[PDB]
Structure formats: structure tokens, C-alpha cells
Design a protein around this ligand. Structure first.
Ligand code: PUW
Ligand code: PUW
Ligand code: PUW
Ligand code: NI
Lengths: 340, 340, 340
């Protein structure tokens, strides 16, 4: 058996809390120069159907820091495509690596990869959701609490397009019992199906959620979060199209931050298109925490990797007697046996 | 000096036997959670001119499991092409990595890479042959013997196109003293030059070989093996073209397996095109061993890497006095010496 | 704080001397089978905007040999481009890897990467200069001194186009107090701005420099060095164009070597276009040292990596008490704490 990390919809608040603390304790070790060798000789397959800097480099660096290795399996480098299905790729990689991740164009790809694999599979972003971004963002908000506020007393407002990150921020904030708002224009708001999933989180958590085009909704935000306006990477809105939909109302400028409140922190998943969703003043300013946020992509990925591999090993333990037998037989062979 | 693994034509039965046992003993160690650090700090260059999932990931995972690292040198990433020849690439990489592999469009490329390199070179597939697939397939057949049969008493029938895998399966089966058949249609059968090389293997080994379009030839097979119908990756047959040549006679369906025999196991090098060469029923069925086969691509590559590097080191031993001298001088330099 | 390696213009002769000795002592260790684990669990980001065999493989192999790992971040794989600026890429990678290198189309890219990063950045070649090639070439000339000559008594003549390598060879040779010549045709010579920088090196070093189209200038060379004629990779001269400019006067043939002197050694940064800049006879001949030169790309990159990371760690030391605290808290968490 195994466990996947495809959506936080399969994780409780208490589980996400553990993942936060695990990630933070690994971070503090590494920040101070102790690299815990928790994944010695382990291999991670990384399937990327789209561009990535933070997610990809976090996975690859994480593996090295923990004593393992990440393999960048790009499109067209591997047989997946015309020559081979997702199902076969999954079943085969299950024999050849210890853990798998993928950034996919369509969510069904990551779901099928997970369902067909006997090893843990992690969603590195889909058109639906972005669960590693959730955990990284949670870690970041935990590290940047307003003085005299608990996490669940905080208000998080996402500004602009209903992207997979928008929705993921909603999923995680409501899961943790926080107050969430999507401030977005008509036609680009979280839809009713998405809102129903947020409602369902709030029934359990005590959190709240609002989807609105009212500019006053940013007032009181502890975290103000934004993303690009060009939509899905395979069918991007042009500069003219997206400016017409979103600008100037949804640009996160200094005026909007101050309307949120003097203490409100700015978050962006990155990459940012400067001068559209956010201005240079905000993103490089005194209240921007998006670079710490970027760091925490690695923070959270180290935690996910360690938890999933530990869970896997506890469910599939090595037989220690057979291990000793196998070590010894190999040693005898190497010492006494020759091709000639 | 060094040794290469370009074709099993340069290896005896007794040598292939050693490579099998080496590979199997490393597998048993790793299966039970002991990772033998046999290639510490060693670097493998991986040149891929074509797509690959099993071969590439096996090489990269193998290096990590054994304490080393594999570098994916893709086409156009490196200077090989307009800017630089195979010969120069080989001579230069010989200075920069410890062992080299390549999947090539044309066999002469891998031969020239081998002849110009002072380090071991492994053929990761060519339009002529596929020697790592041979060793993996041998390991698989050894692990899946029919009850009450020795390896050399087994009958292996390849169905369909005379691909490099078809021929490689012939080379290895005849080398080991087994009985080989290519069941293929006129115009797509192993040619006379290829058959002569099989005949020459059989003179030494006591094995046999047949090339035929007779459907009854599958009867008695212990292993029934197939491959895709679209030919060479740079000039693929279309769906319509290849179906016209091969379908339905050469599709491995449940009817063909049962005609072979109730105990016959199904093998495919993968990737498979489901619904052409083989049906979903066979490939996912009770007698399919192609996923174990896929696993054994890694099994065999770990063995090849270890043998070739051990052979290299025995032929080019480190001077231990110089090693100690060099370690100490470096330590003095690092402790006492400064850029300022 | 940190230090970069973008140009040798920021390094003294005495500093380059240290880098040579460091590199040579690491080489001698590794040549004799001791791999110094000086970069344990460290991650290197490698941004390549252009093709590379020696530079890329040297970086990736170097990291493995020293106990770390190099990540090949290719164009379009990462978000740099339409989606993200160099500045943001730099600031983000500073959080996700420990050291960064890049081969860039335009020099400003590498300068901006360096200025925006809090981690060390290395220039892996630009349209302006090639500083890792300088150090590798210096190491090579030091290892191949003519009997009875000091380094600073040697004459180095570069033949042909005023490439970034031509200029870099000038920078390093003059920095070290050597005698430099560019033998090149009118219109393709080092320009006045470039010559001024060489003059400035010579004022301090006691070296000399000449830029000329006089064929007799090769006479007395201890090292005769050449490069391709097709210019910048994004806008290459055709075969016909470059032959018209350079051939036959600037082809390094056996006649030119013998005119330089019987002892003169031939150098090329590679890759070479055989039959243009240099003939098969010279490059494969008794006086060619370009393959040792190629080896020393790795030699020098190992030294640069170690020096820059050591400098970084001395400027940003780990707190040992916090390190011990963090190790222990993580151990308690892993032993006592559970997601359930
Ligand atoms: N709507 C676009 C969401 C992008 C999220 N960004 C990331 O995950 C960071 P990177 O891995 O793409 O660098
Ligand atoms: N005639 C096509 C033969 C393909 C052989 N297949 C393999 O080696 C597996 P992969 O490395 O291509 O995934
Ligand atoms: N004028 C072209 C200079 C090329 C320099 N060559 C190199 O750095 C070797 P590689 O890293 O391109 O293989
Ligand atoms: Ni790697």
C-alpha cells in the first residue's frame, strides 16, 4: 500500500499541522547546516508537462539535501505520449523509482498516475489544484502571523483570476479554519462546484469563505495574495485580453495594500508579471513575503517527501534477516567470483 | 585499457551467466533495503538521441542506488551535432566522466563512441541491436523458468517485426543455448546476414533458431515475446501501413497465447501500443511478465555498470601511496593556505 | 555577503595563483582515487542558454565528485523567459540552491544574475568573456611549461577571430604577466576598448600584448591557441562567409606550428571545426594539448566551486549551538511524533 499527495481534500487539519511542523523542523536543521540523510539512495521521478522554477528546483534540491536524487523527466525525453500511456508509464516507473511527482496539463493525468502507481505520487500542479503550494503557503503564514493573532483568526484574500492557486489557497485556508475571500471579477470567480467544496471545509473547520467583486472585501486582510492573469499555459490570454478583464481594479498596488491594512502582508505564488497583477512597489516592498514564500516551496516539499517515504516504508517494511542474508551473499560473490 | 558493452557478440555464455548472477545478487540486496555503494562519486554520461523511459531511468536510478550519478545529455543540449563530431565528443567525455552510455539512431555512432573512448561505453539501443535489453530479458527468463525445465530447454518465440529487439532476443537466446523462433511476415523477417549470426551462435551453444511465417510455430513456446510495429523512430510506419502488414495475424491475443500453451509467459520490451501487437487481455493478464521484465531493465543495468567499472579499475588501479600523498597535501593546503 | 566569478577582472594575479594550486591539488587527489567530500549535500543550479559539453559536464561531474549535485536548468524548462525576469529568477534561486552558474547569450544576463543573487554566481560563458576557460587554460599552461621557462616568460598567440575566448585568453595571460598576441584579420581583431583593458593589465603585471595581422607574429609562440570562425551561436557565419574571411591565412596547419617553433604547443577551447581553424594533423598531433586542456575545464571548475563555497561559508558561518539544537529537536519529532 501507499499514500499520495494529489489534493489536500484527503488530509485533515491535524494531518496538515503535522506536515507543517515536520517541514519546519527539517528547515531549521538545514538552515543551521545539518542535512538530515532521511532519503539515502532514494530516487524521485519528476514528470514536468509545463515550465517550472520553484517546484522543479525544490524537488531536485530536496532530494540532494536528504541524501537522494531527483530525475527530471521532460516531455518527449521519455516515452509518454504517442508511444506510451500514462497508465503504463505509472506502472513501469513504480518499478524504477521510489517516489513520483508530476506537473500536468490536465488533472486526470495526475489522478491516473496516482491510481496506477504502487509508489507515492505527488501533484506538482494541475489545471485544478496546487497542493504543494498550499503546504508551502501554510508554512509561510504560520511563520508570519500578525502579533496577537492565531492562524484561524486570520483573513486571507486572493485577488484576481480563479486560478488553480486561487482555489488551492481556498482549500487550505478553509481546511485550517481560517477566513477566505476570493476578490475577483464576474466570469473569473470560483464557480459553484468550487464554492461547495469550500463550504464543506467550513462546516468541519469553523472557517468562512466569500466570493465577490466588491473592492471593500480586501479591508482587514492579514494576507493579500495574487497570481498572474494569463490563465492556463496551453491557452494563455494575451496582454490586451487580460488587461481588459482585470486592470486597474484587480492590480495589487500600494493603494490596495493600505486599504487592506498597514500590517497586511503580500503573497504571490510566482512567477509574477510585474506591472499587471502587482506593482514593483508592492512585490519588492516592506510588506512582501513572497520570497520567503518561494523558499517555503522547498521547505514544504522536503516535508512531503519525508512523510510519504516514511509512510511507505512503515507499510512496506524491509525484512531485516533477508537484508543481512542479501548483503552477505553479495559480498561473497564480489570477493570470490569472476567473469573469467 | 577498458571493456565495452556494445553487443553480446563479444561475450561468452559463461560471461553472460556471471552478469546475470551479479545483477540478481545486487537486486536481492536492494529489494531488501541494502544499497551497495559500489560506484561512490562516479559519474555516468548518458547520451540519448531517442526517447526512453526504462533505459534512461534505469541508468539514472542505478547510479544513485550505487552511490554515483548519471547525467542526461540530451540532443542539442551538448555540442555534438553541427558543432562537434562523435569522435571528439567521445575523447572529451573520456576526460570528464567515468563511464558512458548512448542510445543512438545509427549503430555506427555507438561503435565510434566506444572505439574513441578510453572509458567503458554501453549501447543503450541502436537500429541494429539492444544488448542491455538482452541481459534484462535473460534475468527475467531465469526468474520465470517453467517448473521442471532448464533455461536451455526453453523455446522463445518472437512475434512480428524484425526489430533490433527481435534480433537481440535471438542473439541472447542462441548464445545461452536456447531454442529461438522469429514468427514474422515475409519482408519483415530477420535477413540472411542476421540468420548467419544466429547460426554461428548455435554451432557453439547447441541451441537452435527458425525464421518463419507459419502460425503453428508459436506452439510449445515457453516465452512468447513481441514489440511494436511502427519500425524506426525517425521514419515510423503509420497506423494504416503497419496494420495492413501485421494485423490480425501477428497480434498477440489470448488465442495465440493458448495456442502457444497454457503455461507460456508473455514478454514485451515496452512501450507497447495496446490493441495492435498485443491486446489488453494478454499484456495485463495472468501470464504477462513484462512488468517484471521492465523492472529487470534496472536489475541488468546495475550489474553491467558494476562489472564494467570493476573491470576498468582492475585494469587501471589507483596507486595507493600516491593517493595517500595527494589526500595529505590537499588537507595541508586547505588548512594552511588562503586566497588573501 | 558573497563573491562571484563573472570576470577575472575582479581577481589579482595572487588570487588566480591560489585558484590554480587549489584546483591542481584537488585534481591529484581525484586522479589517484581520493574524492574529497567538500560540498556534501550542496546544490548547484546550472542555467544554460546555449549548447555545451565541457562546461556543463564539468559542473555536473564536479558536484558529484565533491559530494553534491548539479541541476541542469534548460531554457523553457524553467520559468525564465516570457513568464519571469532574470532578477526574479536570481532572487528565487538564491533561496533554493547554494551556488549558481549560467551560460548566457548576452553578458548583461550573467551580471544581473550575479548582482541580484545572495549566493555565489559563476559565468559559464557570455558574448563578452569566458572566465572558467581562463582558469582551465592557466592550469594547462602551468602543467605544460617549456623546459627552462617560467610562466611569465612565455608567449601565447591566439589565431583568428576576436571571440570571447580570444579576449579571455588575453585577460588571463596579461593578468599573469605573460606575453600575449592576437593574430587576426582586419575587422575581426580585438577592438580598442578590449586592448585598453589588456594595457591596464600589463601596467600592473609587466606583461605585454599585441594585436596584428602580420603572419610572422606566431614566431616564438610557446602556446598557439585557436577557436572556431562561425562567431556567435545565435547569428553564425555560414561556411562560405567565414572561409572567405579567414582561409587559408588563419588556418592552424603544421606549417604554422613549425613557424611558431618545434616546441610550441597547440591549444583550442573546443569544440573544433576540423579543416577550418585547425587541421586534423595539428589537433591530433604530437604538440596538441587541447584534450588535456579539455580535462582541465573540470579541474578548474572543481577549484572555483570549492573556493566560492568556502568563501561563502566563512562569510556566513553556521551557528553550531543552533545546529545541535535543530538536529536534536528534529530527532525527537521523528521518534515521538506521528501524523495520526
Ligand atoms: N496560475 C499559475 C500558478 C503558478 C504557480 N507557480 C509555481 O508553482 C512556481 P513554479 O514551480 O512554476 O516556478
Ligand atoms: N523497437 C523498439 C524497441 C524499444 C525497446 N524499449 C526500451 O528499451 C524501453 P525504453 O528505454 O524505450 O523505455
Ligand atoms: N567561441 C566559442 C567558444 C566556445 C568555448 N567552448 C567551451 O566552453 C566548451 P563547451 O562547454 O561549449 O563544450
Ligand atoms: Ni542529477
Amino acid at each position: 500500500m501507499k499514500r499520495d499527495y494529489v489534493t489536500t481534500e484527503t488530509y485533515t487539519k491535524e494531518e496538515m499541522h503535522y506536515l507543517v511542523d515536520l517541514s519546519l523542523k527539517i528547515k531549521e536543521a538545514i538552515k543551521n547546516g545539518y542535512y538530515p540523510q532521511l532519503l539515502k539512495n532514494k530516487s524521485l521521478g519528476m514528470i514536468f508537462q509545463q515550465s517550472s522554477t520553484r517546484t522543479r528546483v525544490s524537488f531536485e534540491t530536496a532530494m540532494e539535501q536528504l541524501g537522494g536524487h531527483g530525475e527530471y523527466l521532460a516531455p518527449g525525453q521519455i516515452q509518454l505520449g504517442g508511444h506510451e500511456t500514462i497508465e503504463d508509464t505509472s506502472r513501469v516507473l513504480s518499478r524504477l523509482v521510489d517516489i513520483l511527482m508530476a506537473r500536468v496539463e490536465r488533472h486526470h493525468s495526475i489522478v491516473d498516475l496516482a491510481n496506477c502507481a504502487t509508489i507515492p505520487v505527488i501533484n506538482g500542479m494541475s489545471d485544478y489544484n496546487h497542493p504543494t503550494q498550499e503546504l508551502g503557503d501554510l508554512c509561510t503564514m504560520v511563520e508570519h502571523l500578525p502579533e496577537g493573532k492565531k492562524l484561524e483568526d486570520c483573513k486571507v484574500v486572493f485577488v484576481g483570476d480563479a486560478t488553480q492557486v486561487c482555489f488551492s489557497l481556498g482549500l487550505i485556508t478553509t481546511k485550517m479554519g481560517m477566513n477566505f475571500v476570493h476578490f475577483g471579477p464576474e466570469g473569473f470567480q470560483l464557480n459553484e462546484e468550487h464554492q461547495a467544496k469550500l463550504a464543506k471545509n467550513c462546516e468541519v473547520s469553523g472557517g468562512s469563505f466569500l466570493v465577490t467583486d466588491d473592492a471593500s472585501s480586501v479591508e482587514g486582510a492579514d494576507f493579500l495574495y495574487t497570481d498572474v492573469w494569463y490563465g492556463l499555459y496551453e491557452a494563455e490570454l494575451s496582454e490586451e485580453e487580460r488587461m481588459k478583464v482585470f486592470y486597474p481594479k484587480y492590480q495589487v498596488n500600494q493603494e490596495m495594500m493600505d486599504r487592506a491594512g498597514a500590517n497586511c502582508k503580500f503573497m504571490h505564488c510566482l512567477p509574477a508579471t510585474r506591472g499587471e497583477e502587482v506593482t514593483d512597489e508592492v512585490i519588492d516592498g516592506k510588506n512582501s513575503i513572497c520570497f520567503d514564500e518561494a523558499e517555503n516551496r522547498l521547505t514544504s516539499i522536503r516535508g512531503l517527501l519525508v512523510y510519504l517515504m516514511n509512510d511507505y516504508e512503515a507499510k512496506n517494511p524491509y525484512d531485516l534477516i533477508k537484508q543481512a542474508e542479501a548483503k552477505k551473499e553479495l559480498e561473497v560473490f564480489l570477493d570470490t567470483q569472476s567473469i573469467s
